[PDB]
Amino acid sequence: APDAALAAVAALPARIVAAWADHDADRFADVFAEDGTMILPGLFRKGRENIRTHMAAAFAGPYKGTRVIGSPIDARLLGDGIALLITEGGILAPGETEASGDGAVRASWLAVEQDGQWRLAAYQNSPRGND
Amino acid sequence: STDSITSAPDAALAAVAALPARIVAAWADHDADRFADVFAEDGTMILPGLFRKGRENIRTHMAAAFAGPYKGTRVIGSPIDARLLGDGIALLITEGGILAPGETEASGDGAVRASWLAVEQDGQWRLAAYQNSPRGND
């Protein structure tokens, strides 16, 4: 369970980063549990399908041509098959090398094991600040 | 459903939904100690511009925050989602925020959505992680 957890919660951001690199809302949403939630400044989406349709629009608009960066800052096992990862990083526009302003965030990734597979029950980000 | 089917998940969600009232009451009294006591010993608080880990670190932060930026403010909020993730682990999402004197509704940076990730120990539900983000649409 501890080993299983730690690598599982490493896997979830990797999949999100890969989906973002291809601006692929389908692979992005598929990381989430069916009733998973995403909370960002100015946004709440509940359910994999709602996350999917939102990212489809977002990738076509405000997130077009951007890339994601991040590094882990905390990870905890909360119980059998449930883990929380906290990362810092954010979204870079072309020409940027480090996340800044509203693009710089801390994110929480609540991972749950369902059907022998880990999925994101909840993602949330908040501005990193100090900047 | 009969008397042989459990009501534990519903009781869990009710217990987690009661945690915000403990925070509201602590805040009304600018009491950083009662505020921090809602958290697990290694619990985290993430806000725009803030990361604190550990009950005692949250305590010291809120002691300073109540003396400064949050002085004279109050908290409001209502639940928008609750899920039991496993025995003893639940997630509540609320909306609301912090009101300055004379305000009736949270606005701007004061208006947030918050997650309350709660983990049961010793029969008590405590906050493993609190995080808020601006509500926006405003």
Short mmCIF file of N, CA and C in Angstrom, two decimals, chain A residues 11-12 20 24 45 48 55 57 62 71 76 95 107 109-111 115 120 129:
data_model
loop_
_atom_site.label_atom_id
_atom_site.label_comp_id
_atom_site.label_asym_id
_atom_site.label_seq_id
_atom_site.Cartn_x
_atom_site.Cartn_y
_atom_site.Cartn_z
N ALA A 11 2.07 8.99 -10.88
CA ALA A 11 1.58 8.68 -12.21
C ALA A 11 0.52 9.68 -12.66
N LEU A 12 -0.31 10.13 -11.73
CA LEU A 12 -1.43 10.96 -12.12
C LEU A 12 -0.98 12.29 -12.74
N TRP A 20 -1.86 17.40 -21.52
CA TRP A 20 -1.75 18.84 -21.74
C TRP A 20 -0.80 19.14 -22.89
N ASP A 24 -5.10 17.55 -25.24
CA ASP A 24 -6.03 16.43 -25.39
C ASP A 24 -6.97 16.34 -24.17
N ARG A 45 -15.72 22.36 -11.70
CA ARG A 45 -16.36 21.39 -12.56
C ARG A 45 -16.47 20.08 -11.80
N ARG A 48 -16.43 13.67 -14.63
CA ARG A 48 -15.49 13.50 -15.74
C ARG A 48 -15.97 14.11 -17.06
N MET A 55 -12.30 21.23 -20.66
CA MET A 55 -10.93 21.26 -21.16
C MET A 55 -10.87 21.27 -22.68
N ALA A 57 -12.82 23.06 -24.49
CA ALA A 57 -12.90 24.47 -24.82
C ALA A 57 -11.62 25.18 -24.38
N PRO A 62 -7.81 29.63 -24.03
CA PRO A 62 -6.83 30.19 -23.09
C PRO A 62 -5.59 29.32 -22.86
N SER A 71 6.63 20.22 -9.65
CA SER A 71 7.48 19.40 -8.80
C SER A 71 6.70 19.13 -7.52
N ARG A 76 1.14 12.28 1.09
CA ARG A 76 0.66 11.54 2.26
C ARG A 76 -0.30 10.42 1.87
N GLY A 95 7.81 31.30 -24.58
CA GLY A 95 8.84 32.24 -24.20
C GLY A 95 9.13 32.24 -22.70
N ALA A 107 -0.90 22.90 -6.36
CA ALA A 107 -2.01 22.03 -6.70
C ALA A 107 -2.08 20.83 -5.78
N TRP A 109 -3.69 16.92 -5.44
CA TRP A 109 -4.10 15.80 -6.27
C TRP A 109 -4.55 14.70 -5.31
N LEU A 110 -5.86 14.50 -5.21
CA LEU A 110 -6.39 13.47 -4.32
C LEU A 110 -6.66 12.24 -5.16
N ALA A 111 -5.86 11.19 -4.94
CA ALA A 111 -5.90 9.98 -5.74
C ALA A 111 -6.62 8.87 -4.98
N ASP A 115 -11.31 0.04 -8.87
CA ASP A 115 -11.15 -1.07 -9.81
C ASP A 115 -9.68 -1.39 -10.06
N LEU A 120 -8.04 10.34 -10.24
CA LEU A 120 -8.10 11.58 -9.48
C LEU A 120 -9.50 11.86 -8.99
N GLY A 129 1.83 32.74 -5.36
CA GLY A 129 2.14 34.01 -4.73
C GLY A 129 3.56 34.10 -4.22
#
